[model samples]
Target chain A: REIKGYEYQLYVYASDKLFRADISEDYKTRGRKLLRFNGPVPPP
Target chain B: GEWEIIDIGPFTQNLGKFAVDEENKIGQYGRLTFNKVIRPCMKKTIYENE
Candidate 1:
């Protein structure tokens, strides 16, 4: 069997907003570990 | 902890989709339909300061 995955590509400009995916903080040891979204860091 | 600010420019990378495999490659990862809600902006004051 072969693993099939698309060669994903995205173009984000300097002004494009980003948000983090809804992942657990526990997994984020270093605050830098962010899976951002296209929006501001969600309001806490 | 202290705070510091730097600037980022138009960038590109092959690593798309978030997979926390290594801590080194962690931080603000993903994409979305380019929309106004998530646009990044710098205040004129901040821009001048920078």
Candidate 2:
């Protein structure tokens, strides 16, 4: 058996809004993370 | 909160899905929409590009 999942890729110029997603408060432990957006910490 | 995600761009892993897996703790995690990424303008501002 295999896993079937659906994902959509979106793109845009990085801006302040990303800052919100970059919040390190929601997940306190995950907060140990940085400017991450369910994605990367670089190449913004 | 009804969760949402706008990822699908962290092209490191195998391409992913458009939804979340509540059972697996994975899903849409985007906190902002496309319009939101657009910088906000101060309406009552006596400044440039208001």
Candidate 3:
């Protein structure tokens, strides 16, 4: 995971009502990893 | 990290039991459903987390 995890995702988006899934802190460095929300980065 | 595409639309990130409409499919990752589309995308990115 390169972004945020489920706990944070929900806490920030659905819970906190923050902006998009996008955050301002590096989730990994904060002891949090991006959750497995399957998607794509580019068109393959 | 990259999670499965539960639902794809113009500008909404849905999960669990989700649904999308037609005509709104214009992104690189065309129309995708959770049941049909879901795979690891090299975890999340540094820039994305922040």
Candidate 4:
């Protein structure tokens, strides 16, 4: 399920296909970490 | 520079344009804030593509 309370949706260009990560008041810290590591992110 | 489109083009910065460095800093774009204000930066990408 798409979690509510999101704030930003960040996009990347590493894997050829456009990818994105979601951030929010609740999950922005984890979002930043995921972005730093380029780890798993939410579905776009 | 392989740039990706973030949501709302995220309020540009520096040199008066939508920049990637801005994205690197704010995790998307612009001189962001923890407040309630989130602009797609200026009028270029916001209106040009819309």
Q: By DockQ, who's the top model here? A: 3
Tens-place lDDT digits, model 1, residues A1-44: 01111111122322354432322122123222233334344332
DockQ, model 3, C-alpha based: 0.08
- DockQ for the candidates, in order: 0.06, 0.06, 0.08, 0.03
Across B1-50, the per-residue lDDT of candidate 1 in tens digits comes to 11232222332121222312221243344423332212232111112121
Chain A TM-scores of each predicted structure, in the order given, are 0.19, 0.19, 0.20, 0.30
lDDT of 2 by residue, B14-37 (tens): 111111111123324443223223
Cα lDDT for residue A19, model 4?
36
Residue pairs whose backbone atoms clash in candidate 4: B11-B40, B11-B41, B12-B41
lDDT of 3 at A38: 27
Give the alpha carbon lDDT tens digit for every residue of B1-50 in model 3.
Answer: 44443223322233221222221143233543332222211222333445
Ranking by DockQ: 3, 1, 2, 4
The best candidate by TM-score is 4
**Candidate 2: deviation at residue A35, Å?**
14
Model 1: what TM-score for its first chain? 0.19
lDDT of 4 by residue, A1-44 (tens): 12322334444333332333333322323332222213224434
User: What i-RMS does each candidate reach, in Å?
Assistant: 15.5, 17.8, 11.8, 13.7
The true-versus-predicted C-alpha distance at residue A38 of model 2, in Å, is 5.4
Against the true structure, what is each candidate's TM-score?
0.21, 0.17, 0.18, 0.22
C-alpha-based local distance difference test score of model 3: 0.29
Q: Candidate 4 versus the native: TM-score? A: 0.22
* Model 3 chain A weakest 10-residue run by lDDT: A11-20
Best candidate (score: lDDT): 4
